[PDB]
Amino acid sequence: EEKPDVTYSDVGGCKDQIEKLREVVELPLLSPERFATLGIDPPKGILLYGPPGTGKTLCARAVANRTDATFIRVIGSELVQKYVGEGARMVRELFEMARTKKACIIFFDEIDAVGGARFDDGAGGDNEVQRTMLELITQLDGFDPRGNIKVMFATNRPNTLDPALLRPGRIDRKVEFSLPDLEGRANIFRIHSKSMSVERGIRWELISRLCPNSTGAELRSVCTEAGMFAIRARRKVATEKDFLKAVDKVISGYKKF
Amino acid sequence: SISVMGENEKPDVTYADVGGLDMQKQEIREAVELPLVQADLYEQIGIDPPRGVLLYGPPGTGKTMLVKAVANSTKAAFIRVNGSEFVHKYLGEGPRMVRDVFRLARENAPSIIFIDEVDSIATKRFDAQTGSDREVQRILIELLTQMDGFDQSTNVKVIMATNRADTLDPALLRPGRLDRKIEFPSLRDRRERRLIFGTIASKMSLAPEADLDSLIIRNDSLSGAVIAAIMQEAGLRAVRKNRYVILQSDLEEAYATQVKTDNTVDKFDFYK
Amino acid sequence: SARLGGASIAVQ
Amino acid sequence: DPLVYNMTSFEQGEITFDGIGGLTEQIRELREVIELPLKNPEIFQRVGIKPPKGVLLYGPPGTGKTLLAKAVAATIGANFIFSPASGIVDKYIGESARIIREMFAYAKEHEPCIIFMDEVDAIGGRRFSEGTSADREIQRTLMELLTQMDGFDNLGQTKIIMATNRPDTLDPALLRPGRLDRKVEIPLPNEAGRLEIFKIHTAKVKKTGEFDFEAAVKMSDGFNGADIRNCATEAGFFAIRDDRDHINPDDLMKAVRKVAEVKKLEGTIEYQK
Amino acid sequence: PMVSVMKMDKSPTESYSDIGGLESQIQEIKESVELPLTHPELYEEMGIKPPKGVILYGAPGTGKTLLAKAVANQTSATFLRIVGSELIQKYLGDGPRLCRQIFKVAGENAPSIVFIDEIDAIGTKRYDSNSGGEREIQRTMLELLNQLDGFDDRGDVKVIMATNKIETLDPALIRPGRIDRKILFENPDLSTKKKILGIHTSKMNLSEDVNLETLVTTKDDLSGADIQAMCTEAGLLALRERRMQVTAEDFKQAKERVMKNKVEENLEGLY
Amino acid sequence: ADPLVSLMMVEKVPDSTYDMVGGLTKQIKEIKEVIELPVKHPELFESLGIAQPKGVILYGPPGTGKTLLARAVAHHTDCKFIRVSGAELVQKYIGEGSRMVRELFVMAREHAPSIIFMDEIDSIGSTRVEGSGGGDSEVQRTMLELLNQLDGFETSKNIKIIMATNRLDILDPALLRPGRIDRKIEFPPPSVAARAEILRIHSRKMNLTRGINLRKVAEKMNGCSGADVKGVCTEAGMYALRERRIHVTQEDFELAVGKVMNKNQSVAKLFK
Amino acid sequence: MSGYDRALSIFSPDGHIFQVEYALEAVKRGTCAVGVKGKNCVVLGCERRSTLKLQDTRITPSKVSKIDSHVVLSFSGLNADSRILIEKARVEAQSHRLTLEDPVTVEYLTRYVAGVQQRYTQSGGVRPFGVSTLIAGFDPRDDEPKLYQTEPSGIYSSWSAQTIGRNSKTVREFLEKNYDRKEPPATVEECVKLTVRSLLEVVQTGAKNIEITVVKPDSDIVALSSEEINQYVTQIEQEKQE
Amino acid sequence: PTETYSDVGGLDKQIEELVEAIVLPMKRADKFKDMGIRAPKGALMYGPPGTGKTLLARACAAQTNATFLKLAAPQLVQMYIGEGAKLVRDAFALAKEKAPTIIFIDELDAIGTKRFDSEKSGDREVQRTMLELLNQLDGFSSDDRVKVLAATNRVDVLDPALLRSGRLDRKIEFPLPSEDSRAQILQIHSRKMTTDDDINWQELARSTDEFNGAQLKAVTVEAGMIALRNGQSSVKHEDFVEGISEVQARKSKSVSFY
Ligand SMILES: Nc1ncnc2c1ncn2[C@@H]1O[C@H](COP(=O)(O)OP(=O)(O)OP(=O)(O)O)[C@@H](O)[C@H]1O
Ligand SMILES: Nc1ncnc2c1ncn2[C@@H]1O[C@H](COP(=O)(O)OP(=O)(O)OP(=O)(O)O)[C@@H](O)[C@H]1O
Ligand SMILES: Nc1ncnc2c1ncn2[C@@H]1O[C@H](COP(=O)(O)OP(=O)(O)OP(=O)(O)O)[C@@H](O)[C@H]1O
Ligand SMILES: Nc1ncnc2c1ncn2[C@@H]1O[C@H](COP(=O)(O)OP(=O)(O)O)[C@@H](O)[C@H]1O
Ligand SMILES: Nc1ncnc2c1ncn2[C@@H]1O[C@H](COP(=O)(O)OP(=O)(O)O)[C@@H](O)[C@H]1O
Ligand SMILES: Nc1ncnc2c1ncn2[C@@H]1O[C@H](COP(=O)(O)OP(=O)(O)O)[C@@H](O)[C@H]1O
């Protein structure tokens, strides 16, 4: 909760949103005086979204370690939609935990089936799903403008979520995330396949040339399949061509649907 | 459990309260009740009995009624059923509703059942690309086997009724399941209308000082249900003038009342 | 409970 | 279901025929047919009639048919139900149609009682050979109605009336007489037929001036049968806006002229025979 | 307790040299499974997790099952044969709880894994779920989708499955965090087909020697499995004999026959 | 101990045999080729060590001679036989369908050897699905596997199914294959010589007739079915029964044949 | 669609142009073929898909197709489109011979018929040539052997051997194994037993199906006799004895 | 808050016209209720999002005060619902004790289902409950200064129940603004933050194109931030230029030939 331990050096990628997520995490927290002369406390609370596993999670995690920030692990549909009694009762206890706590952040995920669609008045319906949703909306604007706490949400799909609760003043922003260019594809072999038995002096862009539009976390599997062939040789250590044989298996060997 | 009807009610009509279609008033007889009554005479020759039939035609023409007098004259067990209730909210309620009716027939046999309309649940293709419209086909398949699968019954068979006779599968329309089909056309032939007017008219009050051939030959392209309306409306051409028994000009005042709407629908701007 | 799932419906 | 146990709201309440104009003969064509079985049924047995079963209306909308659909309630004192031909469908097949059996029986358990049914063009199709995966559902929903009024199940001492703004597209098998034994068209009337309808509103509210109709109604060759209740109130709507709470024939003119062109910009769409 | 009869312990028959002669994938499970547990330190020599899971592509009547029949002895360890139809219940929560327990025995059966088939009952990327019922079916997915990956420390397990068509059905559940890879079967090559069938009839007469090498051809895209049918259709044709006697023409009469039912296209444009 | 209830379908044969199934003698010859092997020299292919064939499909147009074989074959069984009629879609409590089928074999496993039967799984047959359709497709998904990879070492061991349908070209290709099936055999309409037999055989019990050559009727009548001809064999009696001469004639066959299709009947030959 | 640039014009977001890769995705459904150049000879080969012994054997419209004494053409896939390229090539031959007073090269020929297709896919109201072809033969008074392969996108690329159409990838790997830029086959019969042998994987020993020519210096063109072929079809199979 | 009537622009034309349709519901029963003539019992109306209809709605309650509780159909969508449909019917006799307070429903009815058939899912309980709460209700010309109502996205899609169009049909499409309007709106959203006055919105007023009212609130809230994105206490006013296009971001990536 108090340390994710994941850095900017952990992240290659597009990287650019983080200096924009370096906006509201600091000046409310450190220095509104830069903007006190014009519209003090001008930011109020933001959101994230992107396709699955584009570092949308890892991004905010990349900064909770910074600022001595202290976030949560009771997240999304996992631990509050399934074993359930008086979800807001935890939230009252949550803010009761958080009412005076400092250098801490809310954040959670999975919110498609949580508060994204309102059931369209079907599928059997659920009320506790909403009350604990609204119970936040009660606790939301308690002291956040004059206070110091922040708020961050996440989605695989923002417009798939609920736009009903988007009454501004309650909400500020939703920032996007997509796949990176080759350079974001470049500095990730510098960490992913780093931690492996591999030869040195190896150019790691030709693979980047030859893996177009694609997210990051699969490269972990490309690494997982990369280190598979000195094996297959009963040899020891990774070449670069081993990637090329692997990239053949996994992109055009995957695009078939 | 599905139902059955005896003498709580009946349709309260007769062969004599109907007329015309006389060749159909005997083909139906030999299939249904004569086998039920007079059995040995053809079991002298022991051929398998003909069985339940179909009967189609344009809307009306007694496609639904002819049952009603023979129903009154059944001397066997009988129903009051149509087609578009076999469906149910759940899935297996439908087929489960219908397996037992033959058991109900067989539990009460010899007897026969009926449908007023079927074309909803009988089509050519047994369409495939929807979770719904197969579950109707299952209602089709099940009778299609319960009709003439293994060891069906002594009974005669599910009597159809439609407004149309092409939409539906040949697998149902073939011997052993629908050994007779019947047409009910009107055509306005003069051999019969000169009765059935009189049939409908003789039952009802009528002035014996009045024309009747003022319209028969005068009109030649007619149906069977509408005609009740004119000699229904003929009475209503009277009481509006608080008349207590009809007059001759009522029919002439009625002739174009029900029929004469020949053609005015966008004549010039039809095709040209 | 005293039941389980089963249903059917149109699509459009 | 309980939904059948909800529709019935004003089964009796009398809003009589004096509050209507233009239709002194249609009602002569209709007071004839309905009430007589339900007043003096032995006449049709005095004379030998298979009595009627079924009527409808047609003509463009906003015209006064629904008033007639209820104005008969005043004459009878007997029962009535209101219901559309739209709020029937749902997901679960048959549930839409089962209701139809639920209700005609519900008529039989308390009568004299009859039925109304709006906007039947939704249930007013020609049974197609080809179809979608689902549009045939309403067709199988329909024919229950096609059955029950004249089906093997005999019927008596109840009545149905329906209405559209689109007589075409209908399955002729419905239009078989016996399923309904007389038709009628309610048109936009003539000026005088449009003139009783004009004054009934003045007949209630505080009139002040003389007639001043025949030239006002010279503009009345455009209206429908129902935009005038708007017009009637619209005069006092701003006769008063000058805080002049005693109306005049001075101010309606600004209204009745006004309505015509705001009505024009999306009017005269179709007429349906 | 509930799954003791579901708990397989059978010792089936099938093996290599009972295989028909695939080679190009016989290894890659031993990659997936064997080299992991045979010598998992090499994972550490590479510094990795040796992989998890596998799905089979659409190869209906190709051998999409038989490797499960293969491994059953070469496996040299415990195993399960589960299948998706069993999962579903006359009651509501009694199903998904099953998945939570059956891994414990799998925990108890440490060097034990499973084959699954028929998962097309489950893998479905359309969850409007108008009812209350199939919401459970979604609930039948979640806990398992959870129980799979919610389990870490797969030092020993290999939770794998297979089907006949995926490209329009299964979710976007795929993630190396959950499922790694996916390996394909499909129709064979000629020399692939050549390995198949004398080995079958190796346990059979061949009264006479009938140069099967010219019997078949790559142009006729046979199934992989109309050929044991071929091998027995002819003895059927000797079942249309008193002679228990082998003949080439019998095979000739068979492929002419069975392909009379099989499809054929128009060479209209001579394309 | 004793088995589940819904398997009452294990039951005795109806009245039928291989005299009343004429014409298609080579077909029926095949359908015991799958039967005589494991029984009459089971060790033919077993001690030759060849392979063990298993169940089959037989299709064709409606009313061609499928079902009577499927029942009459049981008459000459020396084994055990069962029945279905589409009841496998008892789909409320969805899993019960899967329960229903897994029980269906283990019982037969208890009672094996036992050939078994299906009819019109055209209902169950397809898999192409995008947004709706499930709730039965499980039950095809399971039986397909119920024969393979869990019991497959002995699943189709000694149980020897068959299957009878129409429209083989709409359901899955998964099912027809050599896996789970052997011979997509086929019932066409008859030949001129076939139809004589099939007309001669429902003609048995009629009367002490005379003055007949009952084949030229077949020359009056093209390929229609070897199933409907009982139809024209039927009303020939009725037409004479209609006039009480229990004795019969060729004249009526000339009539009744024309009764059926001349009424069951477009010059736009733009083609050559 | 006079003009209209229907979808031939519409590039892809990937970059490709749909109807072209579609074309030679269709070409592989047709009869294979093959070419080889050895030391002094050049060789070609095709097949006849199996008929019912009715496909008229005498005057079949074949795959080899002359241009002059010293050039031929073989192709693959579509056929109605093949017949015009064969025409508006040899047209230019009789023309080139005339207005330059000397015959064609081959590096003049493949440029044309590989450039023509580009106009039938960079114009309006035109479908491409759903076909792929190759050229073969010598230049005048020169021992050098040449064959050029060309395909509907409009590119021509020389070779030493190559195959087009159906199951080529089942074949060409056999040829890269045996054939080598090291060292040709010696002479005619060497190329052929090497040539034919490579087919056999898709052949079901239909010697009738396959038809062959050669090409030699001084334009000694010829097609060969089924007996001369079949007596290679067998002795090569006599070598199978292991 | 108790913001003014306007807060929106210079739209005196609608509002000074509109509530004339609400004076009689508000008051004037002396001869109105002595004339007994028609009374729109909740001026339900329309206009897709982008407008200040909520503001025109709520600011009209600046004169007819109304407690801040206004709950919508997404409160009426739960499991085995009807207690929510109980709530709505009790909602007015509740408020009918003593209040000109009037809540504001909001309806995107088929924003969850399709409309391939015009015969539509006019939602279950709203279509039912809206009747009784509308049929059996008067305002007494005092302590009922307005009449509770709602609004929707598009007036083409509804199954008009009894009196759904009988009397309650007072309705206007809010005409989207023009350049004389617009520049004075965005002025409002900078009343709390001042900047370099070198370029007025009147300078911008010709540069606008296809801008509805709500999203214009997404202009200075960012462009006020895009200045202090570079920490200038003196707010610049060209950050609007490169921020207005952030409505959709333009995918501006290295214009090659342009
Ligand atoms: N030939 C006739 N003899 C006596 N009455 C007739 C005749 N033709 C029509 N009718 C009258 O017209 C009505 C015809 O009803 P009918 O049985 O034709 O319903 P239907 O329209 O055929 O039913 P469906 O629409 O299901 O086919 C009867 O009520 C009967 O009074
Ligand atoms: N190369 C081969 N080696 C071994 N068996 C083969 C080979 N080719 C075909 N077969 C045959 O193919 C059949 C297996 O088909 P396949 O495994 O694809 O279906 P299945 O997996 O049993 O189907 P399901 O698992 O869905 O029930 C077996 O009967 C087997 O004899
Ligand atoms: N060769 C024959 N000999 C005697 N009767 C025959 C013969 N062929 C067909 N029939 C007749 O045809 C009927 C059987 O029809 P068949 O079984 O072909 O259709 P079905 O299978 O019932 O329909 P479905 O295919 O939809 O199940 C029996 O009544 C039988 O008398
Ligand atoms: N630029 C990057 N640097 C490091 N890891 C990355 C990068 N881009 C993607 N990833 C990978 O993407 C994954 C993000 O997972 P996560 O965001 O939690 O999934 P989801 O987006 O579905 O919640 C991580 O496993 C991480 O390794
Ligand atoms: N003839 C009429 N007399 C009085 N009011 C009428 C008349 N015609 C229409 N109206 C007005 O139309 C409204 C409803 O009429 P209705 O019967 O529903 O016609 P429609 O069905 O065409 O809408 C009422 O407000 C009523 O005042
Ligand atoms: N003409 C306008 N002038 C000022 N603000 C406006 C205008 N139109 C919309 N807005 C802004 O939009 C919001 C009000 O929109 P609202 O009426 O609630 O529309 P919706 O009901 O569709 O959300 C407020 O934040 C307001 O500042």
Asked whether H54 lines ligand 6 (CB < 6 A), one says: yes
C-alpha D224 to ligand 5 mean position (Å): 9
Does any CB of chain E come closer than 8 Å to the CB of residue F150? Answer: yes
Nearest 10 degrees: Cα torsion H139, H142, H143, H149: 40
Strands G42-45 and G33-37: antiparallel
Q: How far is D44 from chain H (nearest CA, A)?
A: 36
CA quadruple G169, G172, G173, G178: dihedral, nearest 10: 170
Instruction: From chain F, pick out residues whose CB is under 8 angstroms from the CB of E164.
Output: 174
Bridge partner list, F164 = F58
Residue A160 near chain E (CB below 8 Å): no
Q: Which two tokens stand for residue B135?
A: 């579950």
Q: Using a 6 Å cutoff on CB, does residue F62 contact ligand 3?
A: yes
The DSSP string of D205-243 is S---S----TTTGGGTTS--SSHHHHHHHHHHHHHTTTT
Q: What is the SS3 string spanning chain B?
A: CCCCECCCCCCCCCCCCCCCCCCHHHHHHHHHCHHHHCCHHHHCCCCCCCCCCCCCCCCCCCCCCHHHHHHHCCCCEECCCCCCCCCCCCCCHHHHHHHHHHHHHHHHCCECCECCCCHHHCCCCCCCCCCCCCCCHHHHHHHHHHHHCCCCCCCCCCECCCCCCCCCCCCCCCCCCCCCCCCCCCCCCHHHHHHHHHHHHHCCCCCCCCCCCCCCCCCCCCCCCHHHHHHHHHHHHHHCCCCCCCCCHHHHHHHHHHCCCCCCCCCCCCCC
CB within 8 Å: H233 and A37? yes
Distance CA H7, CA G149 (A): 76
H117, closest residue in chain C (CA to CA): C12
Give contacts of E166 with chain A, Cβ < 8 Å. Answer: 257
Measured between beta carbons, the chain F residues lying within 8 angstroms of E232 are 45, 50-51, 53
- Which residues share a beta bridge with A238? A198
Cβ-proximal residues to F265 (8 Å cutoff; 6+ apart), any chain:
none
* E199 to chain F: closest CA residue: F50
**Chain G contact partners (≥3 CB pairs within 8 A):** E
Contact check, Cβ <8 Å, A122/E46: no
Of A202, A123, B118, F86, give the one whose Cα is nearest residue H80.
Answer: A123
Q: Please, do chains A and F touch (3+ CB pairs < 8 Å)?
A: no
Q: Residue E270 is nearest to which of G79, G201, G203, comparing CB atoms?
A: G79
| CB contact at 8 A, E179 and E52 | yes
What's the reported resolution, in angstroms, to a tenth? 4.4
Which of 182-211 (H) contact D at CB < 8 A? none
Residues G10 and G122: their CA atoms lie apart, in Å, by: 11
Q: How far apart are CA D164 and CA C9, in angstroms?
A: 28
Burial environment of residue H102 by CB neighbours within 10 A (0 to 12, 13 to 18, 19 or more): buried
Find the radius of gyration of the CA atoms of chain A: 22
The burial of B129, by beta-carbon neighbours within 10 Å (0-12 exposed, 13-18 middle, 19 or more buried), is given as middle
**CA D249 to mean position of chain CA atoms:** 32
Instruction: Give C8's contacts in chain D (Cβ within 8 Å).
Output: 92-93
In angstroms, how far is the first alpha carbon of chain D from the final one?
Answer: 38
Q: Which atom of ligand 2 is nearest to the CA of E21?
A: 1
> Which DSSP category does D18 fall into?
G
Is residue F190 in contact with ligand 3, taking CB distance under 6 Å?
Answer: no
Q: Whose CA is nearest to atom 10 of ligand 6?
A: H214
The answer to whether the CB of E119 falls within 8 A of the CB of E182 is no
Are 3 or more Cβ–Cβ pairs between D and H shorter than 8 Å? yes
Residues contacting residue G215 through CB under 8 Å, at least 6 positions apart: G41, G42, G43, G44, G70, G72, G136, G137, G138, G145, G221
| Of F207, F205, F228, F203, the residue nearest F215 (C-alpha) | F203
Write down the experimental method used for this entry.
cryo-EM
Name residue G164's beta-bridge partners: G33
| Ligand 4 mutation target, pool A5, A16, A58, most atoms within 8 A of CB | A58
**Separation in Å, CA B102 to CA B98, B160, E243, F86, H121:** 7, 16, 52, 15, 39
Residue D155 in contact with residue D37, Cβ under 8 Å? no
Is A62 in contact with A11 (CB distance < 8 Å)? yes
The answer to whether chain B touches chain A by having 3 or more C-beta pairs less than 8 angstroms apart is no
A194 is in an annotated binding site: no
* Residue ranges at the known binding site of B for ATP: 57-64
Residue B3 C-alpha from the chain's centroid: 21
Q: Taking the alpha carbons of D145, D151, D152, D153 in that order, is the dihedral positive or negative?
A: positive
Rounded-to-10 torsion of CA B23, B25, B28, B31: -90
Mutation target for H interface from D83, D86, D89, D141: give the one with most H CBs within 10 A: D86
CA atoms within 13 A on the CB side of F219: 4
Segments of F105-190 assigned E as strands: 184-186
Distance CA A234, CA A245 (A): 17
Look up residue F126 and give its two tokens.
Answer: 């397809």
CB A197 within 8 A of CB A239: no
Long-range contacts of B97-102 (CB under 8 A, 24+ apart): B97/B2, B98/B139, B98/B142, B98/B143, B98/B146, B99/B142, B99/B146, B99/F85, B99/F87, B100/B1, B100/B2, B101/B2, B102/B146, B102/B152, B102/B153
Q: Which residue of H has its CA nearest to A119?
A: H77
- What is the 3-class SS of F251-263, one letter each residue? HHHHHHHHHHCCC
Cα separation, D27 vs D57, in Å, equals 12
Q: How far apart are CA H249 and CA A20, in angstroms?
A: 15
Q: Which residue of B has its CA nearest to F231?
A: B175
**Residue in E1, E2, E226, E6 with CA at minimum distance from that of residue E116:** E6
CA-nearest residue to C2 within chain E is E91
Q: What residues in H contact D87, CB-CB < 8 Å?
A: 122, 127, 159
- Measured CA to CA, the distance from residue E88 to residue F94 in angstroms comes to 8
Q: How many CB atoms lie within 10 A of CB F235?
A: 25
H or E stretch covering H249: none
Mutate to test the interface with D, among B12, B236, B242, B261 (most CBs of D within 10 A): B236
Two tokens, residue D89: 């469908």
Computed from CA positions of residues F175, F176, F181, F185, in that sequence, does the dihedral angle turn out positive or negative? positive
Cβ distance H32 to D122 less than 8 Å, yes or no, reads: no
User: E262 CA to middle of ligand 3, Å?
Assistant: 26
Query: Residue of the nearest CA to atom 20 in ligand 6?
Result: H49
Contact of G137 with G106, CB cutoff 8 Å: yes
- Cβ neighbours of G210 in E, within 8 Å: none
3-state DSSP assignment of residue E271: coil
What is residue E187's DSSP assignment?
P
Two tokens at G37?
Answer: 């150049």
d(CA A80, CA A89): 11
Angle at Cα E138 formed by Cα E119 and Cα F147, nearest 5°? 25
| H152 ligand 6 Cβ < 6 A | no
C-alpha dist (Å) from residue D11 to D70, D78, D162, H3, H33: 9, 8, 17, 48, 28
Give kind and range of the element (H or E) at residue F10. Answer: none
Side chain identity at residue H35, one-letter code: M
